[model samples]
Target: SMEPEEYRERGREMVDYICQYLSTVRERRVTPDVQPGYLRAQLPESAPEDPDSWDSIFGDIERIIMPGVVHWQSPHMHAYYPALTSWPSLLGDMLADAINCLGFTWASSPACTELEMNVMDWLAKMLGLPEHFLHHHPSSQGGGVLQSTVSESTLIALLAARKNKILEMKTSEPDADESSLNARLVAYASDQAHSSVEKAGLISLVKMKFLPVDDNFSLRGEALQKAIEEDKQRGLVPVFVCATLGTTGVCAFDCLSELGPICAREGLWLHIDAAYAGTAFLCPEFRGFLKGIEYADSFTFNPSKWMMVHFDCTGFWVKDKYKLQQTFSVTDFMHWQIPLSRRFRSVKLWFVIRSFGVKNLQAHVRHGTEMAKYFESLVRNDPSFEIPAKRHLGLVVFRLKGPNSLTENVLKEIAKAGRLFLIPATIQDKLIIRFTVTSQFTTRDDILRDWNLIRDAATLILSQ
Candidate 1:
């Protein structure tokens, strides 16, 4: 182990290095030009025979490691949702790493459990969530928890909904077999819903149906009601309905106002996955998208996506926390989650919230939405491109006005250019490019720079 002074000096150097990296990241290429297996070929085939000096290790990081890294923090990174990292968030994570405490139970670490509980409430109130979801509210059975990701949150909600449905079925059909009930249970989501929802269904062993979305790429109650009625006729029970507040493909939203009542009437659990756009709720204008959230049984959003938090900080809330607790028959967070040991993940969230105040957070979200709108207008102005879907939050999906191959070729050419990065998706059988404002550092100039890059590539590809 290193001496105390040595630890302090190295830690200071690491922080300075990290700060330098974040400061200069915008100047670098957003995506690395290195080919696959480049790093493997450069490194030795075996582990070092002995301990290496810190200077040598740090030198290798600059020479070998950074060349292989795609700078996700760069302003030109517009491929997916933003994974922002602020100074406070980084410091919080660093402190947590140093503590290295396991916070699986309240008894194990009171500060960890309590801080998580408090920070989640702060997030809930910031989003204007229902009072029942607050742990301190009188007669409230609901509360919030920090999950590892929206995927884990989705799975936990599914498991709870599944157990609740089974118990209800057992009470009504006393002679029915438990296995038969599990097999009969069905879940529903929009065709545009994230793959994680389907994965949750698979993990829960429930049959999941992907319903058709409307012209707006939204799953309305009419479509869901029809499916549920048809399933009832076929003797299938509906247990859960996942409404996408902001979908993955084009950030389309399912009409929760229409789906909520149907789920309540049918005794089905309604869960909302607002993975990326959820941060937008901090602004009053975007809160309209969460109009029917009160009717939802569970809701989840990732602060890590756009709230200047590091990865692995997913904010999850349930209307009835006791119901979820009853499913696992354990109140320990360890049992609440799939893992037996969970790190102190709440620190970064707390640090971010405290550091940026409510107003700053709201401004950050509003700025991102404005940047997306600005990018959307650029596409509309260009006669060569046509937006395929409505721009939502910080994502704009567009394509070449001509053939699908042209759009595909444009995407490939932009990647070859390597100054900026973008990903593509398919909407309504037409190939489309997804341009997201994915960095807190992204500005108007950055937007203009990326659009010019895309336009240049399109011009070259179309001429060919």
Candidate 2:
């Protein structure tokens, strides 16, 4: 079973499978049509005792797996942001599994730790991030690491802030009760933030204040200042503030120029989560969105979202890694990673960055904006639909001009048609469809085809 020749043969076959699956993924349904419990009926509940042949396992993937899979690689998959995968990424991931080093400790895998740090520096410079966040920078107190998700990054930042705040209060008062201090801790994020931010607060056991945004759906400094002052007066300790470069529903960017200064002065740890739109910063024009990031204590975004790297690569950096070390002591002061066992994710990140280089990667992001811009123009020309939010990066939100139900029914019909995939979002009480140009393979024709499907779905609903 462990024979090298046998493994080689099966690996080649898997490579062939991947090639065919991705190239023709466009022909597959963007989402599966099966109801719940469908997979349980396809496979046996009991474990098999005897060893199965390679062909038996390989053949079953098509028979059982393909039918249930939502083809995320398809250009027609406009339901979410891109989870891009490339040939170079597959190579690195293959090596990642076969070598299998748990990078929790540097002694366990020095190469893994060092290589990851090197590439993190490479990525930091490319994005024009502050020099302090790079390991290579002289006198730099910051460092970058790969985390699993933006959600986990947010949790890490919140916990660090909590740790630092509690210590500061205790040091000042000398006799301050730790439990009482914990009870007074509070954090802040926009009401429009991803549900994950709220969940982070829940897990941290802090008072989460969801502040209102402006007409543009952006969180401003004034709101944060007002809330912080009220909380202070109420004898609450404001410990953290999460600002978004690009929000989930409408892709609204919080005003970092305004929020940054307040966070710095108030001694609040500022964390920036740019999960989906962060990849656009590779382009100079989009880099302006990160203007005030210097004030941020920590920042994170998913390269797995828009870059050609595969999943499990959320680019994270901290201005003060020592705070993280104090909170997560086993942490890279490996303890930074919540999970003790971290796969060599930097392998694929390195491969993809080198393979595309900065120029090619910049083009990949620019093309996405261009595609979304074209789609927005289509929506504007059509009289029946209206764009509820300003188009940003590769996402466009639109709905029928009148009631919410009309847009809801159109989404239903589009799902019924099964030619394309899209997801809905309710922004400011209005039901709108989020049309994201998700894949590198998406073309002008693909955008047109998707628009036609939306129009046809609307026409079918209105005709009744």
Candidate 3:
């Protein structure tokens, strides 16, 4: 099994399998329609005692495994944002894994550490982020790190922000009780923000206030301004404000222009989470969406979502990397994240940037947007369905006309038929379908195909 020739042949075969699967996945159902225990029923209770032939084991993948899988790479699989996988990125990850180089410190793997720095800088520049986030900026106090996900990114930023707040309070109120001061520290985010923001607060031992958003479902400075003042009047400390550039349910953006000034006046550490929508910033036309980047202390986004890279490659940057280092009292690049073990994820980023080039990469993003716009047009023309929220980037939130039950019924029908896949979101207590253009394989015809399925589902549901 460990022989070189054996590995060479097996690797080629595996690559073939992946290529075939990726190419043909759109013909299969987006999600498995079976029940939860379906996989267990097909699999054995215990491991096999005897070694099986490579053919026997490899053959089982199609026979037993794929039947119950949700083909996320399929063009018809429009649920969350795309977790992309390109050939270049695939080879990059493979080589990085084969190298087995740890990026925990520069000394451990100088190449990995330096490459991570350069790639992150390249990414920051690609997104037109401020100069301070660059590793080689004039100040050299700010930089970026590759996080496992947005959740991990938020957690690390909040933890560092919380520590910074505590230290500042300690210096100002020398006689105050540290525990009590910490208990009074509170954070704020829009109700539409991701659940990860709240989770960060809980993990950091700070109270999280889900502030109300405006009519557009966007968090404005007024709400945050009032909340901070109210909290201050009640003897609470406003430490952090997690502003969202692209919210989940409506894909709403918090008014960074407003929030920036408020956070600056109050001396709050403002953290911006773009997650899925940040990829849009690559286009000059969409750069206006990021109006107040100068005020942000920290920012994060998921390249793994829409950047044609695989999952677990999240970019997190801080304006003051020194604060992070102080919070952890750490070095060797370990202070940048919660864990000491960091993958050479920048290798995949390097591959994607070089292979796709900036021009092709922008085209990839624009293609997704065009698909969503086409889908939105189809929904708008239909009398039975309605566009509940405005389309942005590659996401269109829609639902059938009349009560929420009709939309729910239509979704049930689609799931039963398994023609295409979609997920739901609740905007202001109303259920809406999230038609996200996730796959790079998706084309204009695919949108028409998925829209036809929805129309059919709606027709049947309404008839009943």
Candidate 4:
């Protein structure tokens, strides 16, 4: 067995390793070159009977772990989602681990519970969120929580909408069949909305359909109104509308200001997913993207993606807490998740907010957007490339302005080069290379340099 002092020393070493890893984030390869079964081949599958010496384990780390691990911390990483980390966020995680408190309620850990409430209010205030959204606080109607991912938040929102819609139906027609009545519970989103919206409908076992977007990729009020009216006439209840502020195909913003009145008149739940782009709310110039939040029943964004809070931390706000509680509020109290034993994850979020302050956070958001605009201009000037959609905040969805296979080859070479990485998308039947300059570590030089590489890669692919 290891001695107390040995454990303490090992802990320090682990922290140091993490710190060193983050310091080189911008330079490291975003994804790993390691192959399958590499780790399994190096280490034993079963637990060891005895504890290994720190020296022995640390010696093996280089060969056994480092090569096999993909550095998400690497700025070169532009994959499915952005996960950020910083010095303050690390300290906050350390503090939580040190305390090891299980915050089920006010009674379980007083300080933990109170601190979360206070910090959430601070975050809400920072984001300029509605006052009524502070539900967990005193006399507040709504509040926020630290969800693990955007998908989890979407699921929770869907469940709440499901319960509320069903209850409303029950109240109006007390004798209606519960199972058969839900057939009319249809959900709507633009054809460009994230897959999470469809996944949410699948979870609720209801029909989720996509509304067609305009020529520029934005979801218009006319299309939304037509769908609602058509569904209503057919006795199909339009229960929900999931709007995407920055869609996956391109950075398309659904016109919530237009859809708000339509939802209010017909009594449907509205969820706005600003998952990656919502971080722009911190900036005054970018606030226009969130113009329709006032009409939304729920709003979700990721501070971890753009605001440097780290991964596994997402921010969700609702206009009404009772609706969420009425949907997910539990009585059994024995359930592990969605019920008891919540972690103090919000501590890191608070630490990140206080550490950077609003002004600094705004700068980060603004800087990312500006960099994206720079990239857009580069694509525009190049005769070989064209931007498919307008640049919104930090994401610019562009392409080689050619066939699908040609665009695919350009992305293939970019990814294969391994110096920088980007993801591909399809919009309006045209292939696109979506470039996001949202990373704090991504600067003007990186943007210009990446463009040069992209042009070379495209030219090379086409010549072949």
Candidate 2 error regions (>4 Å): 174-177, 330-333
What's model 4's overall lDDT?
Answer: 0.77
- Residues 1-464, candidate 4: write the lDDT tens digits: 77899878998998898777777666666656766766776778788789877788887776577766666666566555566788789889888888888777667777766776677677777766667666455656667766777777777777777778888899888998866767768889999888888898887798998999987788888998999889888888888888888776677789988988888888888888888877777776667767767778887888877889977788777777778877755412112126566677878888888888899988877777788788888888888887767877777777776678889988888878566768777776788777776467777787777788888998898788
lDDT of 2 by residue, 317-336 (tens): 99998888878763231677
Cα lDDT computed for each candidate against the true fold: 0.88, 0.88, 0.87, 0.77
Query: Could you tell me how far off, in angstroms, the CA of residue 286 lies in candidate 3 after the best superposition?
Result: 0.6
Tell me how many residue pairs clash in candidate 4: 4
lDDT of 2: 0.88
Instruction: List model 1 lDDT by residue over 1-464, tens digit each.
Output: 46899888988989899989998987787778887778887888999888778888788878998888888888888887788889999989998999998888888888888888888888889998888888778877888988889998999999999988888889989898877789999999999999999999887889999999999999999999999999989999899999998898899999989999999888999999999988998888888789888799999999989999989899889998777886767435765667778889998899899999999998888888888999999999989999878986899999999889999999899888579888888987899998888777778998998899899999899889
In the order shown, what is each candidate's alpha-carbon RMSD? Answer: 1.4, 1.3, 1.4, 2.5
**Candidate 4 lDDT score at position 79:** 53
Instruction: Name every residue pair that clashes in candidate 4.
Output: 133-142, 134-142, 135-142, 135-143
lDDT of 3 by residue, 389-448 (tens): 677788899888799999998888899978788887788868899988988878898899
Better of 2 and 4 by lDDT: 2
Candidate 4 lDDT at 144 equals 71
Candidate with the greatest TM-score versus the true structure: 2
